Amino acid sequence: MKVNPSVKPICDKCRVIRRHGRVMVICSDPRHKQRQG
Amino acid sequence: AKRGRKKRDRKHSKANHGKRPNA
Amino acid sequence: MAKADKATAVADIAEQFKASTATVVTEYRGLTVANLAELRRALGDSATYTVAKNTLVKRAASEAGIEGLDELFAGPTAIAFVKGEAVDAAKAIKKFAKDNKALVIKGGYMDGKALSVADVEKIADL
Amino acid sequence: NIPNKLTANVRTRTGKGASRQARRDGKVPAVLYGHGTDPQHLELNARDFAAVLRSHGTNAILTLDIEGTEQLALTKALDVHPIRRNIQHADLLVVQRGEKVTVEVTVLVEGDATPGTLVTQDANTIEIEAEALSIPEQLTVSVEGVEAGTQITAGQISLPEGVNLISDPELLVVNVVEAPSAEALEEE
Amino acid sequence: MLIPRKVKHRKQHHPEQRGIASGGTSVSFGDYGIQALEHAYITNRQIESARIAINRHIKRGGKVWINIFPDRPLTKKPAETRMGSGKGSPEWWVANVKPGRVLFELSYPDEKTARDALTRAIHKLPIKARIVTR
Amino acid sequence: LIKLQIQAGQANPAPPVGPALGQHGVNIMEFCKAYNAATESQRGNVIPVEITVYEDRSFTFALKTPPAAKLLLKAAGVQKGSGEPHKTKVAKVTWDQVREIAETKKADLNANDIDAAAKIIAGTARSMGITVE
Amino acid sequence: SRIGKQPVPVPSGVDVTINGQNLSVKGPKGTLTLDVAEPISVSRAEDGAIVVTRPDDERRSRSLHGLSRTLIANLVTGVTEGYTQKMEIFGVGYRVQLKGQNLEFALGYSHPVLIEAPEGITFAVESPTKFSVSGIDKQKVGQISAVIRRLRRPDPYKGKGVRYEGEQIRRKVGKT
RNA sequence: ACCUCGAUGUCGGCUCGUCGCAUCCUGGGGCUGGAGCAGGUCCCAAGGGUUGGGCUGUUCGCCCAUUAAAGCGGCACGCG
RNA sequence: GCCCCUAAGCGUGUGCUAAGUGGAAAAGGAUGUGCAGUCGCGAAGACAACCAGGAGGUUGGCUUAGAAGCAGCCACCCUU
Ligand SMILES: [Mg+2]
Ligand SMILES: [Mg+2]
Ligand SMILES: [Mg+2]
Ligand SMILES: [Mg+2]
Ligand SMILES: [Mg+2]
Ligand SMILES: [Mg+2]
Ligand SMILES: [Mg+2]
Ligand SMILES: [Mg+2]
Ligand SMILES: [Mg+2]
C-alpha cells in the first residue's frame, strides 16, 4: 500500500475510485494498490 | 512563522480592506 | 483501425460474396487457439473462417440482393460463407454447432431469398 | 466559396468601456473602414462569428446586414488575445463584389516523406491574390517520396485558376531534412 | 547549459516581471508549443532540464525549439557576509518569462507523443503552462 | 502444438526444440529417429515441423514447407540477409527458381493460384529487404 | 436507474406485504423484511410484481433506485430459493469437520479453531476438505464466507488456506 | 537590531520534571526481487521503557559489556 | 453588523456547497458536483454486460546462445 499525495493508474486494468473522503487506486495486482495521503 | 502567517492572513479581513499595520 | 483499411475490407467482402454461393448465420468467436486452428484446417477444404464489423457488413449488403439483411444487422450477426458444395458445408456447420453448444445457427441465404432455421435444416439433408 | 451571412448593429458608444461591456454581453466590436468610405463601427455576435471563423475562417468573406443594408466585407486582421482565445476586435474590408485583394492563406502539408526524414514548415501563410469571392480558404502542399535536403518554396505551390502569388517565389515554405539522431538532438 | 558569450553590463536591476507577453505568443517554428500562464524567471538549468526531458522522451525523431535564451544575470552575496557591500557577482542566468510567451516548441509527428513530451517538460518548470498547436 | 524450424542434416538440437518440446513430456529418441528417416531424402534444406501433441502423449509429425526466409536466402545465394528493408541487397533471384519454390510450397500457403503464391512470396521478400528481377 | 426501472417478478408461492416504507416477504425457505429508502416509493403492481419509483432524478434518488431494487430482488430470491456458498480447503494437513452446529477447522495451527453458525445460517460438509454454508440472508452468507476465508492468512507460495468454490488466487514461486 | 547595558548571570554535570511524534522497542496492518528464521519500504499508534563504564570540560564523538532499545526535539540551545 | 453572548432580519426571491468548506497555504493527484460551447457514435439498435476469438506467409530481418507479437534498432508488409 503506497501512500503518496499523487496516485494514478499504472496498468490498464487498474481503476481509480473515491473512498471515504479520499481517492484510491485498485487492481488485482497488489503492487498497484496505492492511496492518496 | 505561524504567528506572522496568522497576522498576514487576518490582514485580509472585510473590516480592514486588505490593509493592516506591520504587514 | 483505419478508414482505408475498412474500405478495402468492404471491397474484399464484395469480391468474395460475388464468388461464394451459400452462407449461414452464426457467431465467429469459436474457441481457444489450438482447436480453432484445427477447425479452420478442417473447414478449409470448402470454407474459411473470418470476422468483420457491423458497419462493414451493412455497407457490403448493398452490392448483392441481400438488402433484407438490414433487420439482421439491427443487432449483431456473424456470417459464414461456403465456396464448394453446400450440402456438406451445412452438415459440418450443424455438427460443430451441436457439438460445441456455443455456436448458434439462425439461417442462411440462397437463391436470393432468405431461409428460416427449419428450412435450412431440412434442405441441408438433401 | 459563397458568402456567410451575419447581422451587425452600429455601436452607440465607443471606447474601452463600451468595448468591455460589449465583450461581456457576448458581442464583438468591428470596424468597416472599407475601400475608401467612411468607417462604420458595428457589433457582431461572438458566438456565430467564432462559428464562421472555425468553419471557413482565416480571412473568410462575409455579408453584413447593417440595419437591412446588406454589404459584403472581408476580414483582414484578427487580434484574439495574448493568453486566452476570445475575439475582442474585428476589421472588415469591403470587397465591392469583384475587387482583386491580396490576402495571406494558410498552407498545409499532406503526405508522408521518406521514413528516414523529417518535414518542417517554416512559413505558415503565403501572400495570395485572387477574386474576392474566389479566395482559397487553404493551400495544400504534397510530400510523397521526397528525399532529405529538399526545399519546397512558394513558387512550387500549385495555385488554383485566377490565383497569384504576391510574395517572392524563393520563399522556402517546407524543408525536408534527414531525421536527426540522438546526438543531433542532444547537441542543440 | 545556455549562457551569453559576453554581456555589456554584468549586473542588472532584477528585470521586472509584469503585464502580458507582447511577442512570441504564436507558434512559428514547431507544431506543438508550450505557453506559460504565470510570470517568473526561468533559469538555464531549468531550460536544460526541459530540453533533456524532451530529447529523452523523443528518440531519433522530431525537432525542438527554445524561443527563450537566459541572458539576464542575477547576483548573489557570499551568503555569510553582513548586509552592505559591493554588489554580489552573477551566479545563475535567467530568462524573464511572462504569461502568454511560448518557451518551447516541438515538431514530432505523433501528436500524443509530442503532447506527452511537452507535459514532461512543463513538469520540470517553476510555472504553469499549457500545450497549444500551430 | 507448436511449429519449430530446424535444419535437415542435424540431430538432437537442444537450443531450438530442447525445452520447447521436452517440457511437454514427449519422447525425443524415436521422434528424432523418425525425423531423420523422413528428412534423409532431402538432406539439403532446412525443414520445419508443426508438432501437434495428442492427449495420449503420441505424436504424428506433419512435415511442413521450408521457411520462406531461408528459401529466399538460398535462392539469392547469400546465407545472411539484410537488416534494412528496401535499403540493402544481397544478390539476384531467377523467376524460374521463384516458380520452383512456389510450386514446392503451394501446399502450405493460403494462396489459390501460382500468381497469388508469387505475390505472397514477393511480399515476404520485400518485407525482408530483398527484391527479385 | 436502468435496474431500478425494471419490475421484480415475484414467484407464485410468495406472500409480499407492503406497509408504508416497510416491506415483508414470506416464502418456503423463510421470511424476510426490509425498509426501503424514504425518497423512493415501492408499490405492488396488479400482477403481483414489485416496482420502485423515484419522484426526482437527483444523484441520491438515482443511486438509491437500483440499490433498493436489487435489495428487494435478493430478498425475494432468498426467501424463495435461499443462498449457498461452497468453499474448499487446500494444503496438506489442512482439514475441516462438522461438530454439531459449528465447524472445527485444523489449518496447521497448534490448536484447532472453531466457528459457530449464527441464526439464519447453517453449514454442511461433503468431504474433509469440501464444505459449504447455506442461508436466507445473502449479506449474512457473504459475511460468514468472508470470515471463514480470512480465518487463515493468504499464502500464494503453496496456496494453503481457505478458498471459495471457483476461487482463482494469485500464486508466486520461491526459487530459494 | 524590535523590549531589555539606572543587570535577562553565559557551556556542562547532578536533582527535578512537562509536552510533539518526524517511533529505538513493545502493538496492528499493506507491498515485497516475503520459501522459513531473519530483512527492505510504507501507514496508524506517545500507554510504558529507552543501561553501566574508559577517553576527553566537554555538547558531540570513539571504544568495552549487555539489553528491545540504549530515539529525535521544544520548555530563556528547560532547570545556578 | 442584525441566532444568544451583543443593539438590530433563526429577512425575501433565484442557484451552489457535504467538505464545518465557511473557519490558513504551494507544485501536482483526482469518474465530487451545477451551468454553458464543441466533437465521435447511435432505433440504419449506441456503451457495458448474460455467452463465446485474434489465422497463413512467419519464428518479418540486425541484435543476441536466444527476442517465436510483447530488453531493443529498421521498416511495420502480401494472402485467407
Ligand atoms: Mg530594574
Ligand atoms: Mg534585576
Ligand atoms: Mg505517526
Ligand atoms: Mg489506557
Ligand atoms: Mg562517569
Ligand atoms: Mg527532553
Ligand atoms: Mg540554558
Ligand atoms: Mg438581541
Ligand atoms: Mg487548497
PDB file of C-alpha atoms in Angstrom, chain D residues 82-83 85 118 120-121 124 180-182 185-186 188, chain E residues 20 25 35 51 55-56 60-62 64 107 130 134:
ATOM      1  CA  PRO D  82      -2.162  37.022 -25.799  1.00  0.00           C
ATOM      2  CA  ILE D  83      -3.213  34.419 -23.218  1.00  0.00           C
ATOM      3  CA  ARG D  85      -8.810  32.893 -27.043  1.00  0.00           C
ATOM      4  CA  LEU D 118      11.516  14.934 -41.240  1.00  0.00           C
ATOM      5  CA  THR D 120       9.476  21.339 -41.207  1.00  0.00           C
ATOM      6  CA  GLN D 121       7.046  24.108 -42.178  1.00  0.00           C
ATOM      7  CA  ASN D 124       2.527  29.100 -42.433  1.00  0.00           C
ATOM      8  CA  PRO D 180      18.077  13.908 -36.628  1.00  0.00           C
ATOM      9  CA  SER D 181      19.598  11.265 -34.372  1.00  0.00           C
ATOM     10  CA  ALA D 182      20.037  11.180 -30.602  1.00  0.00           C
ATOM     11  CA  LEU D 185      19.027  16.142 -30.694  1.00  0.00           C
ATOM     12  CA  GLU D 186      21.284  16.314 -27.618  1.00  0.00           C
ATOM     13  CA  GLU D 188      21.428  21.537 -29.635  1.00  0.00           C
TER      14      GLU D 188
ATOM     15  CA  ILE E  20       1.298  40.199 -20.621  1.00  0.00           C
ATOM     16  CA  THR E  25       2.877  34.351 -28.375  1.00  0.00           C
ATOM     17  CA  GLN E  35       2.689  28.598 -23.383  1.00  0.00           C
ATOM     18  CA  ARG E  51      15.388  20.126 -23.181  1.00  0.00           C
ATOM     19  CA  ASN E  55      15.118  14.766 -26.125  1.00  0.00           C
ATOM     20  CA  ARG E  56      14.797  11.654 -23.946  1.00  0.00           C
ATOM     21  CA  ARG E  60      15.581   9.800 -33.113  1.00  0.00           C
ATOM     22  CA  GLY E  61      12.694  11.978 -34.256  1.00  0.00           C
ATOM     23  CA  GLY E  62      11.190  15.433 -34.367  1.00  0.00           C
ATOM     24  CA  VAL E  64      12.801  21.016 -30.564  1.00  0.00           C
ATOM     25  CA  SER E 107       7.761  19.168 -34.374  1.00  0.00           C
ATOM     26  CA  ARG E 130      -0.451  24.643 -21.427  1.00  0.00           C
ATOM     27  CA  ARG E 134       0.228  25.769 -34.655  1.00  0.00           C
TER      28      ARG E 134
END
